[PDB]
Amino acid sequence: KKSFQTNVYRMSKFDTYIFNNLYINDYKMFWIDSGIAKLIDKNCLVSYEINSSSIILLKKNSIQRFSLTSLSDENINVSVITISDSFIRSLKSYILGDLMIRNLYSENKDLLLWNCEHNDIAVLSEVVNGFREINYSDEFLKVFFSGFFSKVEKKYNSIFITDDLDAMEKISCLVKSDITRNWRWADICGELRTNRMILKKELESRGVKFRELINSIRISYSISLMKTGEFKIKQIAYQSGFASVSYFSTVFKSTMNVAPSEYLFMLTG
Ligand SMILES: Cc1cccc2c1[C@@H](CCC(=O)O)CCC2
Numbered sequence: 001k002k003s004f005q006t007n008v009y010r011m012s013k014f015d016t017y018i019f020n021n022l023y024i025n026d027y028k029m030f031w032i033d034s035g036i037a038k039l040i041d042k043n044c045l046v047s048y049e050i051n052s053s054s055i056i057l058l059k060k061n062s063i064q065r066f067s068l069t070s071l072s073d074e075n076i077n078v079s080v081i082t083i084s085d086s087f088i089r090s091l092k093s094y095i096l097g098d099l100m101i102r103n104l105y106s107e108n109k110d111l112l113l114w115n116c117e118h119n120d121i122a123v124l125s126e127v128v129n130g131f132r133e134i135n136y137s138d139e140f141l142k143v144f145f146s147g148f149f150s151k152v153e154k155k156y157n158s159i160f161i162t163d164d165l166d167a168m169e170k171i172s173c174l175v176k177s178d179i180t181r182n183w184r185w186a187d188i189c190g191e192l193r194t195n196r197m198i199l200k201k202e203l204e205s206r207g208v209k210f211r212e213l214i215n216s217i218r219i220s221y222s223i224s225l226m227k228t229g230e231f232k233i234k235q236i237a238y239q240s241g242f243a244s245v246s247y248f249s250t251v252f253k254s255t256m257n258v259a260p261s262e263y264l265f266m267l268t269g
Contacts, residue, residue, distance in 0.1 A: 001130060002086075004081055004083055004127050005082040006080065006082070006127060006130065007080050008077050008078070008079050008080075008128060009266055010075055010076075010077055011068075011075065011078055012075050012076075013072060014070055014071070016067050016068065017068045017257065018067045018257040019064055019065065019066055020065050020254060020255055021065065021212055021215070021254070021255055022065070022219075022220070022255055022256070023061075023062075023063055023213075023216035023217050023220045024060055024110075024220070025082075025176070025224060026084060026088075027057075027083040028057070028081065028082050028083070029057045030056050030079060030080040031050075031052070031053075031055050031056065031078070031124070032050060032051070032076050032078050033076065033077045033079065034072070034076060035070065035071070035072025036051055037049070037050050037068050037069060037070055038050075038067075038068070039066060039067070039069075040066055040067045043064070043065050050113070052121070053115050053116055053118075054114070055113070055114040055115075055121075055124070056112070056114075057111070057112040057113075057152060057160065058110065059160055059162070060085075060162065060169075061162070061166075061172050062111070063110075063207065064110065079124070081128060087141075087142075090138075090142055092161070094143070094147075095149060095150055095153075095161055098150065102153070102159065105157050105158050106158045107162075109156050112152050112158075114155070123144055167198070168202040171188055172217060174191050176217065179217075179239075179241045180238075180239075180241035181241070185210055216255065218248075218251075219240070219255045221241070222236050223263070225239060225240065226263065227267055233248075233249075233261055233264065236248075248260070
């Protein structure tokens with residue numbers, strides 16, 4: 001069970017979630033349970049409709065800019081699964097046992113879509129229900145998720161499970177290992193022993209400057225702390241490395257379109 005962190009958000013008619021410079025700290029997937037939603041991806045400048053069988057995948061270490069809008073009147077529950085790095089790395093012996101195909105894939109897609117059948121959605125639902133009803137062996141989930149990811153990578157002809165030595169993974173592991181450190185460019189270069197010229201590409205490829213990058217990682221770090229049931233916003237701001245509650249709230253509102261305490265309540269309730 002520890003391999004997954006899950007949440008279910010309610011969404012009334014024609015209301016919209018809006019995410020800007022949302023940093024994806026760990027592999028995430030989401031789907032709606034009924035009705036129709038509109039997804040506008042500002043990174044790919046595309047909009048499209050999703051239904052109860054559309055699974056949307058967000059790649060680890062991407063910077064997401066999209067909105068999700070309900071086009072139903074009946075309320076909609078959005079389920080989100082965050083997959084722990086421990087579990088992702090246990091899959092490697094399944095995805096990369098098929099590596100000669102995988103070298104020919106590209107690395108441009110951060111938000112992937114899968115139209116699946118009922119069984120796939122029954123499995124992910126039970127994941128979202130904390131396996132209260134059906135329990136699943138570690139081998140079943142490893143086979144299921146590795147097979148799921150390789151189907152989606154095949155569809156887009158692009159790698160989804162990145163590898164450890166990717167520059168942006170090194171930057172982001174480093175920042176997350178010491179969230180309250182006063183990070184500057186010079187620290188990244190010195191820890192990774194890598195020229196600014198080369199590391200720079202990972203931030204411009206994602207449309208961020210250094211400050212918005214650090215801020216996005218800290219917002220996700222703070223969202224992770226809110227999910228643990230820690231409830232004090234003032235503590236969460238300082239624990240996530242911000243210098244004031246005001247600055248944390250301003251960045252949070254800019255990223256999530258909701259105030260930190262509004263989000264903290266969407267979790268515990
Ligand atoms: C709050 C929400 C509602 C609907 C969809 C999505 C979200 C957040 C999930 C928050 C997280 O896990 O950090 C971002 C990904 C997709």
